[PDB]
């Protein structure tokens, strides 16, 4: 019995790794969560967090919870720039930055080859994987970032399967961004395989969480 304190961040901010939520990051175990209700240190790049409320009930009480580098940054993406993926929407102390548990892959020079990457849940608990899908504002923006005007993403486990394509469109400026980025997640059964495959627009997971969720409910309580 010992709650998870999120300070000025909400669940979204903490679990993505908004750069203001680095201080209190991983406590090992908790019975309920305390957060700041509708803080703007959730999603720094504008968009929609899909199945958000389901995730909150998921994360509210956990018996153990271990963060791990599911796709290590300097190893898993040899044909994709894993560095330029930063933005003034997600500022960290001077520079342009991004969420800590995802990477915004962009094209290397000229050419964005089909990526594909799998992870098998060896960890014995369930694994929480989160990822992002970027929707550029214009055709130019798409070709700048990914080259491939006609790009797709695919995420799949044995339970989950979705194909995303970017809706390219100029949306109201929020935090100087006219494009949008949606956030998704799935729990990976033990011994099951998650599979990413993309030709663009995929913000890949870097960190994932192996967790042992608790019986019934936790409770999430705001300041």
């Amino acid at each position: 019995v010992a709650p998870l304190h999120l300070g000025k961040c909400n669940i979204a901010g903490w679990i993505l790794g908004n750069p203001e939520c680095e201080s209190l990051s991983t406590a090992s175990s908790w019975s309920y969560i305390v957060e700041t209700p509708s803080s703007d240190n959730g999603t720094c790049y504008p968009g929609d967090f899909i199945d958000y409320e389901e995730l909150r009930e998921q994360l509210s009480s956990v018996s153990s919870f271990e963060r791990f580098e599911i796709f290590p940054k300097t190893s898993s993406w040899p044909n994709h720039d894993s560095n330029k993926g930063v933005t003034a929407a997600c500022p960290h102390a001077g520079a342009k930055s991004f969420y800590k548990n995802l990477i915004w892959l962009v094209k290397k020079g000229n050419s964005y080859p089909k990526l594909s990457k799998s992870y098998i849940n060896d960890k014995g608990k369930e694994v929480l994987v989160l990822w992002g899908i970027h929707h550029p504002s214009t055709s130019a923006d798409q070709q700048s970032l990914y080259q491939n005007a006609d790009a797709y993403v695919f995420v799949g486990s044995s339970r989950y399967s979705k194909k995303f394509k970017p809706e390219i469109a100029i949306r109201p400026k929020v935090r100087d961004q006219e494009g949008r980025m949606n956030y998704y997640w799935t729990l990976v059964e033990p011994g099951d395989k998650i599979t990413f495959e993309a030709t663009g627009n995929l913000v890949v997971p870097r960190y994932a969480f192996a967790m042992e969720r608790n019986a019934g409910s936790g409770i999430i309580i705001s300041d």
Partner: antibody
Framework: QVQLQESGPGLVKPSETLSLTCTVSGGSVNTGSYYWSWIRQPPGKGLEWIAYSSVSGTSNYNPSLKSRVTLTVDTSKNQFSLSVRSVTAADTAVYFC????????????????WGQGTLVIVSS | QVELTQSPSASASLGTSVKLTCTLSSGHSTYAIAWHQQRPGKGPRYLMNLSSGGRHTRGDGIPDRFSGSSSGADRYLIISSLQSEDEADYYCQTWDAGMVFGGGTKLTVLG
């Protein structure tokens, strides 16, 4: 196997509309990660890209000619077609049709099959 | 978007290697390209594509003696054991917002 071949008039009067048609054998304009493209070479000079379209996905045009070109694909006849409006002598060229290969695995975009090319003179 | 620069002409003797050059514009040195050959009065023929770090991948039925490499912004097409049927214009092409070509390099084969 894969062959492209151009067809249309050899001659067009100024401000009329130039209209060619490529015809693909050895393959289908529906299948594949491909775009169907047009390139011209005015006499004595280099290759200029005009535009491409695919059946499904996005078309792409050379900005200084976008306003005057229209591309169409005829799935059934295995043909695609270029239409350039308001021609002048500066549109005099050999027009080539070609397959632009979006090779998914590398992300490269390279013309791997070219037509024999057809000459179009723009003269009154 | 990118530009390609090829000097217009090259010459070399039968039997030698020749090294044709394509130069990517400043700020595009990581780009990849393709190479094409246009013998006189014919259509072009795709020869190979070429990565920024020198990996060349020939088209179908293009002989072994065609190859390629890279140094910075330059992209090379090596033709070894040069033969008199290699006399042709060689265009490089790449892609960015659009498809772009080099101006071509007319190779003359001497000997």
């Amino acid at each position: 196997q894969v062959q492209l071949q151009e067809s249309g008039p050899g001659l067009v009067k100024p401000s009329e509309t130039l209209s060619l048609t490529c015809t693909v054998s050895g393959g289908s304009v529906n299948t594949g990660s491909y775009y169907w493209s047009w390139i011209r070479q005015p006499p004595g000079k280099g290759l200029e890209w005009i535009a491409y379209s695919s059946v499904s996905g996005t078309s792409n045009y050379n900005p200084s000619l976008k306003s005057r070109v229209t591309l169409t694909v005829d799935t059934s006849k295995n043909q695609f077609s270029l239409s350039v409006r308001s021609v002048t002598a500066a549109d005099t060229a050999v027009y080539f049709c070609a397959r632009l290969n979006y090779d998914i695995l590398t992300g490269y975009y390279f013309f791997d099959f070219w037509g024999q090319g057809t000459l179009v003179i723009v003269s009154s | 978007q990118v530009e390609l620069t090829q000097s217009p002409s090259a010459s070399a003797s039968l039997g030698t290697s020749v090294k044709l050059t394509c130069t990517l514009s400043s700020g595009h040195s990581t780009y990849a390209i393709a190479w094409h050959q246009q013998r006189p009065g014919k259509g072009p023929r795709y020869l190979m594509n070429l990565s920024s770090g020198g990996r060349h991948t020939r088209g179908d039925g293009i002989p072994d003696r065609f190859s390629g490499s890279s140094s910075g912004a330059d992209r090379y097409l090596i033709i070894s054991s040069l033969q008199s049927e290699d006399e042709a214009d060689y265009y490089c092409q790449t892609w960015d917002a659009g498809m772009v070509f080099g101006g071509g390099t007319k190779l003359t084969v001497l000997g």
